[PDB]
């Protein structure tokens, strides 16, 4: 932690006097002190870094995006001074990149990370941070290149292994991803004890038919990442009643359920008219959840936002649902038609959050061949009837009928969420 250059050593008493104000929680006094030092010693890297750290603390205290933007600029100013110690330069830009990601400036974060790697090309850990940068904007191709270079220099870096494995799995290279995820988690390196990697390791093992999969679910549950071996969502509010199957009465949404069941044929008829006359509005499932088959969805609400063009194709259904904010305001759910054809098998999986319950209304249900398992219980749909399950539990679907199967999916807020939580939880 060598932070002082030749000059900063001669003014260390003034620098320490300012930092002491910051460590003693006197943030506003600290900012003014470091501002004065910056004004008096405009080339001091330690003074400039002190100003940035005080601005950083001030933004936390005030919860101000505008103050944090100021800190992010001051962190950069440190890097442009002459004679900056390498440790100070690294610390300053790293914090800058971190704070850019916090604000959602992912492109800015990436440029900072590319500068850090150009300045310190032998620093493996900075390359790992850059790979994460790419993963956050969904750029799996560039993330993959970065971790390949890291695994070339240091083959047993456990952080690079799990992220490499995560990318392979996301690219549907299931069997290839398993040794990277497994060895990465077993390395115990910092950053590998993460629920995402246990989730995808157990799932890749389930898909290749490896019984060891449930060992990792149980280890993930023992390490605190999963509520149970069955319930493996990662964006959770703790304490919510956890139960695979729900009756209408237990949810308290009886008016919504009665409305769906009383009016189900109207919902069916608008779904069939879209199939027949606007089938381009049904989009294929795009989350790699199928082993095989054809499965498409026509989405009316997503993240609590009404899809206006979609509601032009199902206007009476959209009018009916407007009455029920417990589903239309569910920012962690959707409302959508779901069509599935014969020969379809949906892999076991869970949704991302325990904050919703998922209702299925049967619209066109073949007499045989269609079933849904949630946890250890298999059920089937009925036309005009609502089924309710918590899709944060492992569930699986088969379509082996002789014709198409159409249902209506309505997500509601978990009933035990308070209104404060419903309005403040980030959308998913």
């Amino acid at each position: 932690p060598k932070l002082l250059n030749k000059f900063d050593k001669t003014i260390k008493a003034e620098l320490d006097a300012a930092e002491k104000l910051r460590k003693r929680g006197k943030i506003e006094e600290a900012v003014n002190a470091f501002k004065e030092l910056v004004r008096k010693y405009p080339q001091s890297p330690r003074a400039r870094y002190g100003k940035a750290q005080c601005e950083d603390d001030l933004a936390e205290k005030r919860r101000s995006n505008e103050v944090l933007r100021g800190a992010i600029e001051t962190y950069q100013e440190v890097a442009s001074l002459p004679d900056v110690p390498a440790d100070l330069l690294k610390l300053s830009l790293k914090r800058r990149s971190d704070r850019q990601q916090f604000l959602g400036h992912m492109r800015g974060s990436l440029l900072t990370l590319q500068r850090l790697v150009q300045l310190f090309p032998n620093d493996t850990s900075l390359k790992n941070d850059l790979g994460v940068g790419y993963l956050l904007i969904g750029d799996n191709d560039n993330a993959k290149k970065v971790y390949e270079e890291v695994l070339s220099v240091t083959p047993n870096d456990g952080f690079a292994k799990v992220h490499y494995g995560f990318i392979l799995k996301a690219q549907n290279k299931i069997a290839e991803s398993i040794p990277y995820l497994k060895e990465g988690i077993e390395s115990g390196d910092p950053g590998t004890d993460d629920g995402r990697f246990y989730f995808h390791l157990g799932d890749a093992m389930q898909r290749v038919g490896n019984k060891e999969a449930y060992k990792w679910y149980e280890l993930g549950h023992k390490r605190g990442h999963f509520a149970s071996v069955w319930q493996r969502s990662l964006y959770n509010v703790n304490g919510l009643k956890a139960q695979p199957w729900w009756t209408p009465k237990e949810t308290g949404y009886t008016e919504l359920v009665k409305s769906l069941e009383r009016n189900w044929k109207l919902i069916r008829d608008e779904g069939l008219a879209v199939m027949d006359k606007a089938k381009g509005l049904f989009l294929p499932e795009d989350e790699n959840l199928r082993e095989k088959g054809d499965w498409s969805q026509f989405t009316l609400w997503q993240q609590g936002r009404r899809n206006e063009n979609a509601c032009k194709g199902a206007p009476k259904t959209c009018t009916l649902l407007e009455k029920f904010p417990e589903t239309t305001g569910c920012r962690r759910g959707q409302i959508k038609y779901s069509i599935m054809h014969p020969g379809t098998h949906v892999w076991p999986h869970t949704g991302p959050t325990n904050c919703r319950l998922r209702m299925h209304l049967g619209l066109v249900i073949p007499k045989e061949g269609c079933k849904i398992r949630c946890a250890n219980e298999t059920k089937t749909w009925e036309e005009g009837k609502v089924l309710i399950f918590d899709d944060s539990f492992e569930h699986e679907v088969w379509q082996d009928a002789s014709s198409f199967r159409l249902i209506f999916i309505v997500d509601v807020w978990h009933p035990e969420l308070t209104p404060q939580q419903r309005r403040s939880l980030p959308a998913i």
Binding site: A59, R63, S64, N65, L68, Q101, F102, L103, G104, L135, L136, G138, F166, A170, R196, F199, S233, L234, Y235, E285, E287, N288, L289, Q302, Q303, Q334, H349, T350, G351, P352, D391, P426, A427, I428
Partner: peptide
């Protein structure tokens, strides 16, 4: 990408500061 039915993205939420 968004996490609708599954957990396939590296992150499912969006960061918007404070």
């Amino acid at each position: 990408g968004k996490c609708k039915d599954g957990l396939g993205e590296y992150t499912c939420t969006s960061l918007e500061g404070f």
